[PDB]
């Protein structure tokens, strides 16, 4: 209107002083940031053997949520719960009913790495969950082939932090249950079928295939050009 006046700016070369912009691309980041990003990328390079290419097949979110829902039923105890049980079973059985028969048998996930490992060794395990994102990874590389040879159902999953939360811990790296009540065995089998199909049965094939090989945006598009524009 007739007091405001529309005066654009060129923002062009040799004139029209340049504005501010999103320079997140051209950042000179800190060292640790560059390190984690470049480690990720380098790991993406350098063709990965099948023994690690097992990983990065984690799950569908739907099956993930279903499984987690199952596992939440078989939580461990907490401070107050262990406190209560130990007050009561003691108070009764110590001068009363049988030692530790004065309180119910428990059910839970039976977490803990070496515990899990021994259970699998003893075939006493029923289902296994393996966080994909461990560091170091030799902790866990040997579990899938192990469970395969032992005929046990496993899956690789996401969020070792989620595993931790499942135990009221920061992280677990593992979670693998046996004790299941009769009510949940149907869902147990339901998940087992699809999961062995997805992970366990495909083991021997994935064990054949490598990973990596990727280029990255620039050289990748460049190879696409050197192939398409030239062939």
């Amino acid at each position: 209107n007739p007091l405001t006046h529309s005066t654009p700016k060129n923002f062009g070369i040799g004139q029209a002083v340049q504005p501010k912009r999103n320079l997140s691309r051209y950042v000179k980041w800190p060292e640790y940031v560059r390190v984690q990003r470049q480690k990720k990328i380098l790991s993406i390079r350098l063709k990965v053997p099948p023994t690690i290419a097992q990983f990065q097949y984690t799950l569908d979110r739907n099956t993930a949520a279903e499984t987690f829902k199952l596992f939440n039923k078989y939580r461990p105890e907490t401070a107050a719960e262990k406190k209560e049980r130990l007050t009561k079973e003691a108070a009764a059985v110590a001068e009363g009913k049988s030692k530790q028969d004065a309180s119910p048998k428990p059910y839970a996930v039976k977490y803990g790495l070496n515990h899990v490992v021994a259970l699998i060794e003893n075939k006493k395990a029923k289902l296994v969950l393996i966080a994909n994102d461990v560091d170091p990874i030799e902790l866990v590389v040997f579990l899938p082939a192990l469970c395969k040879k032992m005929g046990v159902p496993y899956a690789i999953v996401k969020g070792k932090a989620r595993l931790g939360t499942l135990v009221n811990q920061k992280t677990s790296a593992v979670a693998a249950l046996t004790e299941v009540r009769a009510e949940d065995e149907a869902a147990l089998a339901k998940l087992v079928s699809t999961i062995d199909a997805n992970f366990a049965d495909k083991y021997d094939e994935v064990k054949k295939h490598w990973g990596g090989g990727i280029l990255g945006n620039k050289a990748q598009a460049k190879m696409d050009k050197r192939a398409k524009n030239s062939d």
Binding site: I13, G14, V17, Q18
Partner: protein, 252 residues
């Protein structure tokens, strides 16, 4: 024996450069989006004698494109430039004296000065008085232009490397004798402590290989192999020949 003169110069203490009266080092800009795509104009505000160096300098200003300021830069004079002149610079820049361009942006037979050996080295070659460097051909394969150098040589470098049109000012400095020790003295105090110079054959054997006497003479050949040792290397070095010669091609 002792340590010889030239063995000692690596440590500097005496033999460093006398850079008080220097202006800032003379250089091109930092390469950037403008020169990379388009051009930019700068203005020479004044040109000046730097000391301990012929080939006078020019202080040039540009608009900081990315911020409200001025960026001053120290270019090497180009034999005709002058105050108040506009100095265009970049890929799309005009082909005139003083302007600075890549090499693919110009033809062969053209010449240039202060040229970059690599993009963003900010000037390596043809930085001396009355010198210059020639373009002789291009090769868009790998963006490689080829050139001829004041040593008579030839080279190949990136065609995108920047260089300033013309030849460097100063010119016939060498054609004037010094006539005497003192002008040389001043000429060299403004640079370094590399002068006067004593002759090895006058020195003593401990102070030099040549050294000892009863007669000012050397004793053995003064062509000291390229595979020799520091402290042995005094005289002629990789002598592919020696004595006076004719003639004469630099390279062809």
């Amino acid at each position: 024996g002792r340590v010889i003169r030239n063995q000692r110069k690596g440590a500097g203490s005496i033999f460093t450069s006398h850079t008080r009266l220097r202006q800032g080092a003379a250089k091109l800009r930092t390469l950037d989006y403008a020169e990379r795509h388009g051009y930019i104009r700068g203005i020479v505000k004044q040109i000046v004698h730097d000391s301990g160096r012929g080939a006078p300098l020019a202080k040039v200003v540009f608009r900081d494109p990315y911020k409200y300021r001025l960026r001053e830069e120290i270019f090497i004079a180009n034999e005709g430039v002058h105050t108040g002149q506009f100095i265009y610079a970049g890929k799309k820049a005009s082909l005139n004296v003083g302007n600075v361009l890549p090499l693919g942006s110009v033809p062969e037979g053209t010449i240039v000065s202060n040229v970059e050996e690599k993009p963003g080295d900010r000037g390596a070659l043809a930085r001396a008085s009355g010198n210059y460097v020639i373009i002789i051909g291009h090769n868009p394969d790998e963006n490689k232009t080829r050139v001829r150098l004041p040593s008579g040589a030839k080279k190949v470098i990136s065609s995108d490397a920047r260089g300033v049109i013309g030849v460097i000012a100063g010119g016939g400095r060498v054609d004037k004798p010094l006539l005497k020790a003192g002008r040389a003295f001043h000429k060299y105090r403004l640079k370094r402590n590399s002068w006067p110079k004593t002759r090895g054959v006058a020195m003593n054997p401990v102070d030099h290989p040549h050294g000892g006497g009863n007669h000012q003479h050397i004793g053995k050949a003064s062509t000291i192999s390229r595979g020799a040792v520091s402290g042995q290397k005094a005289g002629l070095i990789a002598a592919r020949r020696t004595g006076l010669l004719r003639g004469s091609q630099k390279t062809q």
